[PDB]
Amino acid sequence: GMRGLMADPQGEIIDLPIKTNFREGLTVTEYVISSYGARKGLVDTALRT
Amino acid sequence: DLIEIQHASFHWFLEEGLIEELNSFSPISDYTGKLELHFLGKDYKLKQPKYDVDESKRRDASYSVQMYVPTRLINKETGEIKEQEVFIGDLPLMTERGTFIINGAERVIVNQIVRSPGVYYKKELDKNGRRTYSASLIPNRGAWLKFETDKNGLVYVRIKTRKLSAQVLLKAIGLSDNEILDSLHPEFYQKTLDKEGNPTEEEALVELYKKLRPPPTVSGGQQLLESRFFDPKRYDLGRVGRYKLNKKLRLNEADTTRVLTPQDILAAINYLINLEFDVGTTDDIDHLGNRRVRSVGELLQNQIRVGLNRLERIIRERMTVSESDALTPASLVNPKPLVAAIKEFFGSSQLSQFMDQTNPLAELTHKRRISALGPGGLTRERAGFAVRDIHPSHHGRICPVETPEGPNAGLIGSLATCARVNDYGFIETPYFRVESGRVRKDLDPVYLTADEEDDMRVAPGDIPTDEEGNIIGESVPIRYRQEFSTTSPEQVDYVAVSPVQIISVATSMIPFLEHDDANRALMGSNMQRQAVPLLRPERPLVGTGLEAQAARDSGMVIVSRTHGIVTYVDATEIRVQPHSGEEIVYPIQKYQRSNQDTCLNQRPLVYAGEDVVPGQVLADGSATEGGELALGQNILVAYMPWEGYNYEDAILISERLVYDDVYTSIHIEKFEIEARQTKLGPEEITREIPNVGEDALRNLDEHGIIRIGAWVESGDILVGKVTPKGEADQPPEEKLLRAIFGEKARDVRDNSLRVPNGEKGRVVDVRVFTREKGDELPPGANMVVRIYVAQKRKIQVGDKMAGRHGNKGIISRILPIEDMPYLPDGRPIDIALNPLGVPSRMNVGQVFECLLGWAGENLGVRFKITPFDMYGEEASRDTVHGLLEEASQRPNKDWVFNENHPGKIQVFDGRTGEPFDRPITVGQAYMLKLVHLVDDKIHARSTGPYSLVTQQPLGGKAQQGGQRFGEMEVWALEAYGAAYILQELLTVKSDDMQGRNEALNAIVKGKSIPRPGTPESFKVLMRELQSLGLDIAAHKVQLSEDGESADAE
Amino acid sequence: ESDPLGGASKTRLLVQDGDQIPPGAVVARTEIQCKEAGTVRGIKEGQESIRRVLLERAADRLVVDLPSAPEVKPGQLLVAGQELVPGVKLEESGKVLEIYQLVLRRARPYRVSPGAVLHIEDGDLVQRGDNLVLLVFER
Amino acid sequence: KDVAGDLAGEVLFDRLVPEEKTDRQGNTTRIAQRGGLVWILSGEVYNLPPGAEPVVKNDEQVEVGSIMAETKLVTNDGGVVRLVSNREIEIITASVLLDQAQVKLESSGGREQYVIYTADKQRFLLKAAPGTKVQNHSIVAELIDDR
RNA sequence: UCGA
């Protein structure tokens, strides 16, 4: 389906969505937006333990 | 070139960094003024080294050079010039790969990222009140200027200590009342001038001394303020601190770099007052325009600066006690505090790290790491959520994917592919100019230094362009002021030069990166730096094309430089002749030991009589194939669950990977022994050792040392060493046993070097380093023997294997080829992977890789697919399914592609011969073999060594340690009913000198005894609390008796 | 070098070296050139207020020549989307300059919610991409 | 919510009045009780330095490459300008030059000082140093006396 | 520093 609306590293939802998925392939613009949530989900795991 | 932050930094130190440190140190004077000492820094020698690059690694030395400067010692009264070259210190040189050799071990210098010097303003709300603006003038070295602004128009200056009024500092530096208000709006400054008095030029130095140093002195107030910001060799803004002052405050003067100008303090107050008038920009601490990086050329400049300051105290303490003349200038300079300053930075500092040399990918990555820790950076406890996240200014400079997971999640970054650091210490990214909707790809890039945020509009390298005409797309997504937007293509300014500009050099080796998740691409980049070099590597079929550039920049690939004709090629050297002393020899290393117990073997590639070009591969490395890099093998894979053998991330391989020497690596271990000097008697290496017969004295050459090429197993003797003893405290049992059969005990004790448990191999280097041979030895040693043992390890059950997409696993079963499933041509299946881990982790690119490598298997073409496309849905699915249709058009291969199920074929079972009910996806996967083998994880202990104080078992595999039963493990047994297991694990297994003897004697005899004694760790705590002044004791509550119990006695 | 929003700055010296300069005279004269020509607007009424100058070029004024009937008011703001007379529409919003070819100066309106703090005045000059208002809302 | 502009030019207001509700919160606020529409006209905006003066008044036509703003650089209290090889200009208000001035660096005894050998058979030692400041009623030279 |  659709990837959705990702957010900033501070928490602000960007108005530019990611209309593709992991089968169609993301763009270079849609890859750095998805990296904001992957880094946020990574550093929140280490502080959770 | 990918290594420019290490080569250009050490080149700047050898011509600009070392000259600037010696020019500021010179000249020096005495207390009276009799003689003066000044150096000539721009004429140093930098003589030849002592040992070779490979010789310094085995001799336990450092590849260093001696530093000599000419020194002119002049005298004030009597005219005399004493010119003499004096030794300064030992400086380790950078090798051809960009590394240093310290004590025989290769080390790197990790680049550390810190804050840039300058003025930074920040809006701060301390409580629910008014808006307060702060300031911070950060220098390169010295004290800080922190200007704050409270409510009701009160601007204060804080110079760690209590704050003070702004008029106290502004008048003590030397100013008038009319020189302040003319360059200031002055109506806001009247509120802070009312409740501050109005001091004169001399009515402010006294009050400044009373609050900083709490009798005031008119001469003490000037010497205190000048030593903080105006004195040389105590306050430095730096070359980049002057650049940031003239940009933020917009100053006209420049090139000061030494003394803080008092006009700059007035400009920082004027920018702070105007922030309340809604004009001016608030700086960001996480912006890369405010964050600098430093390297070996800068970090060595601070170590000689603190090393020459220790030399200044001895040079001034020798020109005052010796009141006589006729003294040599070579005795005034003591090299001992400066030698120990350089040796502390390269061997004892945290930022000089142990180099990872598993494969050439980890060697290239470790020289480009960007860590935020070090002596002057950050702390592991002071790191927060904002410093570990990704800033929007990291686009193309720092890799957002490659970072280690766990504790250092975000603090240790990696440099990107096209990133470059200038002379000021800022990361730059190349960009192509776009003029009227046309990418000008004709000239050199611009290399913007992160100034495209508030001024320029930057498009990434993903937009469809035409052939020099225009841009195809009508809506171009750009980034402007750290926000993404889609504007017209005629309004853009710059465009990226490559789609791999964001990712690093290790993330770029992953094909189909856009189809994988960002969490699994983090793991796929880390597992690629742990792959062992195999015996015969193979190039990938779905490679990205960047493997050829990373192999040449690693330094382990012999390249040509002469454009000549190859004459002689053997397994040790390659001899060519240069043309437009004409016979150069390229040496080839054969099976050299690495830092991570791997091989560094090089193999010849060229033949005799072949034209070469500058930049051609002459001899590839261990983990390098012809030209490109090769870290694994291309073998068949199938995504099907077996009978529980691939249940939870487990790997099922075949027996064909064992006898074909697939995933077979060579590991070379190194052992160490030393014949030290015992004060009872000198130790020597003999062959006739006591209590060892002919079962272990077969490989010795009547010298106590083994020969070359002897197969050693677990429990042998490498070096037979004896040690004299002087105990003479024999028990009465041993005196009666010896008196019967004779055989009186000798005065020596067997201390022979032995092979540890689970270790075997073939001895390849038995190099012995003794005295009177031309090498230096440590004190308290007579003979140093070094043994190198090489072994050939195959792939077994329990080893950790992984791919390029984060699909790690551990092999649990090796099946024969008749039990594995087979393709309809009769070819069996190597790996039977589990398809359940694919859709839960979004590993889609590993399905695109195996389906494309299977198309390249039947064709033999070795595709090179760059990441981050082209037409949508026409570049990944129809590329794979279109090339699989071309492989099915061959008359011999009609079973490769099917019309109903495209990426699937019919697989037959190997045990029963019946086909499966559903078609299975097959393909050629590229798997790697990691360093986490099953041999390094085996540890067991019955009874070994014990601790020094608590008398508990030790911990470690190399010293026969025991497993720790921590506090979370006690809570599980306390939640159980296991009270007797908990008392056994705490008393008879640890910290009891009496209970361990009776428990071990009970098992051998066969009758166990209950009631263990008091543990030793409680009696240590009892004596420690009594030494703190606390009368703590244990009593008995028995009938009419309250007596203290003696737990120790 | 100067920025793109600044313009072209020149350096010229009125007097040479080795002369008799009177006290209270000019020494250097640095002038600022103009990229595009037009009519200077947005002059400040108060003295000693020189921060930025406006240069309305020829491309900033769109001319629309309708043949049916010119129906416009002096000082009226036209929003693109409405129809003046039946038979023609609009494509660019802005203000009208002259009252048959009606020229339109290009502009873009912005709606401000009531109760919001603004950081702009009436009659000043703005740049491309600066903060103007601060809209407040409840969520 | 930050609302940034897209074009540059003159700011025009439509049915929006400002209000000064000054309180002890931040002491710099301006709210609008009736928020209407704000308009931004078109035109190129060129910023000026704070020391420059605008020589073009309102409703004046400009040409391509003409003069827009001339900076008035007036340095009073100076009569003679002197420069050989430098970047910043320097003006000199007073200059003195005594007759028969001949200095010589004949200081073989101790430290190097420029002894002024004038035509009146006098040797003046330069007590002042090249590079330091001098004030009113200061010592600049001192002659050597055999008596 | 690196694995879970």
UniProtKB/Swiss-Prot annotation, chain A:
Tell me the function of this protein. DNA-dependent RNA polymerase catalyzes the transcription of DNA into RNA using the four ribonucleoside triphosphates as substrates.
Family, according to the entry, reads as follows: Belongs to the RNA polymerase beta' chain family. RpoC2 subfamily.
What name does UniProt use for this protein? DNA-directed RNA polymerase subunit beta'
Describe, as the record does, how this protein assembles with itself and its partners. Answer: In cyanobacteria the RNAP catalytic core is composed of 2 alpha, 1 beta, 1 beta', 1 gamma and 1 omega subunit. When a sigma factor is associated with the core the holoenzyme is formed, which can initiate transcription.
Residues included from the entire protein:
142 to 190 of 1317
Q: Which residues form a coiled coil?
A: none
Signal sequence region:
none
Swiss-Prot record, chain B:
Question: Which reactions fall under this protein's catalytic activity?
Answer: RNA(n) + a ribonucleoside 5'-triphosphate = RNA(n+1) + diphosphate
CDD domains linked to this entry: RNA_pol_B_RPB2
Keyword field contains Transcription: yes
- EC number(s) per UniProt? 2.7.7.6
- UniProt cross-references to InterPro entries, sorted A to Z: DNA-dir_RNA_pol_bsu_ext_1_sf, DNA-dir_RNA_pol_bsu_external_1, DNA-dir_RNA_pol_su2, DNA-dir_RNAP_su2_dom, DNA-dir_RNAP_su2_hyb_sf, RNA_pol_bsu_bac, RNA_pol_bsu_CS, RNA_pol_bsu_protrusion
A GO cellular component term found in this entry reads:
DNA-directed RNA polymerase complex
Q: Which GO terms describe its biological process?
A: DNA-templated transcription
Keywords for this entry?
DNA-directed RNA polymerase, Nucleotidyltransferase, Transcription, Transferase
- Give the source's domain of life in one word: Bacteria
Could you confirm whether the keyword 4Fe-4S appears in this record? Answer: no
Sample GO molecular function, one term: ribonucleoside binding
- Assembly state and interactors? In cyanobacteria the RNAP catalytic core is composed of 2 alpha, 1 beta, 1 beta', 1 gamma and 1 omega subunit. When a sigma factor is associated with the core the holoenzyme is formed, which can initiate transcription.
Record family assignment: Belongs to the RNA polymerase beta chain family.
Q: Which HAMAP family match?
A: RNApol_bact_RpoB
**Function per UniProt:** DNA-dependent RNA polymerase catalyzes the transcription of DNA into RNA using the four ribonucleoside triphosphates as substrates.
Q: What is this protein called?
A: DNA-directed RNA polymerase subunit beta
- What phylogenetic lineage does the species belong to? Bacteria, Bacillati, Cyanobacteriota, Cyanophyceae, Synechococcales
